[PDB]
């Protein structure tokens, strides 16, 4: 699967803050 | 001095915490993918990936260690955190660059040459990051000096998208004292080399602005 | 020609067996690395890999099929399938280009567009592998066809470091001749077929000398 | 782990015609 670095980045971080 | 002593020692240990010395990792090396430079190979990719998630998640740790980073919105601590992440992991890798093998190690102690760093996931950034970590090495920085210059450049109210800018300028501002004061004091003999540290953010950025737009290829799950 | 009927029926029959036509298969698409070129991506390099090397056990398993193969030398049989299996490979994918959606279908009925192909494997000769099934298609080849073409690929009595070079000779010329009277008698309105087909390994052979010099990455392995 | 196409083809027969 393609994504941009940006993008994934955003993902792990967004993921580690959900409740 | 004691609420600036007690700042640096905050971040000196936030870093140390989240990231080891190199002295205090077990280094490792492979012969995989040393011949030469290809766009890609899979296995140092798979690890590579792994070892940088690990490493946000880390950085993520490490920003929550710093004073009053909790006490802003999820919003801006996700927004600061987007805005400097690559920066700290430029920054982190490159403060494990062994000159004399012109290797780099991971937080697990895998040790990998230029080649294997081309093809572990730098790719066509190789000599970028490589030309900076070589630039770090006169500066000789310590836990407290990297801990603080990462500090300042996630802590920054000027990212677009923040909702409560001015708090972050608040936060911001002590941490540049800190090394300010921390530099002055730890080699009184050169004093260029508070403003020489805090202007390598801004090759950090050169860097990761060209890396961020960059379309990388993972697994479906 | 009752021995030539023999001979094409086995060939037909060789190919047939070890691989399916479009029409046989169950064609699925998917959405992964659809959007742009990339160098690669990993999960549909995974997928390219496994189906590549399942057709070079088929591509093996199609010569020990042809008359004769199995008569020559272990050393002489590697050599053959070492010279012209990815010729076969190339040849095989492409017989299984569908022209309306610019699609290929491996073995599974797993089906790509021009852009999944090249982030696949294909890479930088995506093109060049297209243009090859696009000159295909006016050719209109049957099974007997594309299976008489592959065996007088493989079997080449030119190739280096044959034992017995004479042999493999001895069996490509009932191959040439199957194949020339077989064209013959399904288009007698079509003189030039025959020697349009054979030159058709010409343009295997400048895709394949390229494929094969590349370097690729593996899983160790 | 590189290999050259033409390296790995090789491989894979040669293991084939293993016995
Ligand atoms: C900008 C460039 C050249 C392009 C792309 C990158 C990437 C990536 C990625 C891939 C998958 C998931 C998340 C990120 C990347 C990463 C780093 C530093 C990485 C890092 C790894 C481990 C540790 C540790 O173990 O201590 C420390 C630092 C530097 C430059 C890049
Ligand atoms: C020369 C080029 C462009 C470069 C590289 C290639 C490769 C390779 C590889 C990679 C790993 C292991 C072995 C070989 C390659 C492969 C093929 C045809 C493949 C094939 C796959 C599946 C089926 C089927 O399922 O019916 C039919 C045909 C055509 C052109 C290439």
């Keep these: 699967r393609l994504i941009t670095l940006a993008d994934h980045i955003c993902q792990i971080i967004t993921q580690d803050f959900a409740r | 001095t004691p609420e600036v002593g007690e700042l640096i020692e905050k971040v000196r240990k936030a870093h140390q915490e989240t990231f080891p010395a190199l002295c205090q990792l077990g280094k490792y090396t492979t012969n995989?993918?040393?011949?030469?430079?290809?766009?890609?190979?899979?296995?140092?990719?798979?690890?590579?990936?792994?070892?940088?998630?690990?490493?946000?998640?880390?950085?993520?740790?490490?920003?929550?260690?710093?004073?009053?980073?909790?006490?802003?919105?999820?919003?801006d601590q996700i927004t600061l955190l987007k805005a400097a992440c690559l920066d700290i992991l430029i920054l982190r890798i490159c403060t494990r660059y062994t000159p004399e093998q012109d290797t780099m190690?991971?937080?697990?102690?895998?040790?990998?040459?230029?080649?294997?760093?081309?093809?572990?996931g730098f790719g066509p950034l190789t000599d970028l990051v490589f030309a900076f970590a070589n630039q770090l090495l006169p500066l000789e920085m310590d836990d407290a000096?990297?801990?603080?210059?990462?500090?300042?450049?996630?802590?920054?109210?000027?990212?677009?998208?923040?909702?409560?800018?001015?708090?972050?300028?608040?936060?911001q501002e002590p941490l540049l004292e800190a090394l300010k004061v921390y530099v002055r004091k730890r080699r009184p003999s050169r004093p260029h080399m508070?403003?020489?540290?805090?202007?390598?953010?801004?090759?950090?950025?050169?860097?990761?602005?060209?890396?961020?737009?960059?379309?990388?290829?993972?697994?479906?799950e």
Tied chains: 1, 4.
Excluded at chain 2, 50 to 61: D, G, P, Y
Excluded at chain 2, 105 to 113: H, I, K, Q, R, V
């Design chain 2, 32 to 75: 995989n993918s040393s011949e030469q430079r290809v766009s890609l190979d899979i296995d140092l990719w798979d690890k590579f990936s792994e070892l940088s998630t690990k490493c946000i998640i880390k950085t993520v740790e490490f920003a929550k260690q710093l004073p009053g980073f909790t006490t802003l919105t999820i919003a």
């Design chain 2, 105 to 120: 190690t991971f937080s697990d102690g895998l040790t990998l040459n230029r080649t294997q760093m081309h093809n572990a």
């Design chain 2, 145 to 171: 000096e990297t801990g603080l210059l990462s500090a300042i450049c996630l802590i920054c109210g000027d990212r677009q998208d923040l909702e409560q800018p001015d708090r972050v300028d608040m936060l």
């Design chain 2, 194 to 220: 508070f403003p020489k540290m805090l202007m390598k953010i801004t090759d950090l950025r050169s860097i990761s602005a060209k890396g961020a737009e960059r379309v990388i290829t993972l697994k479906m």
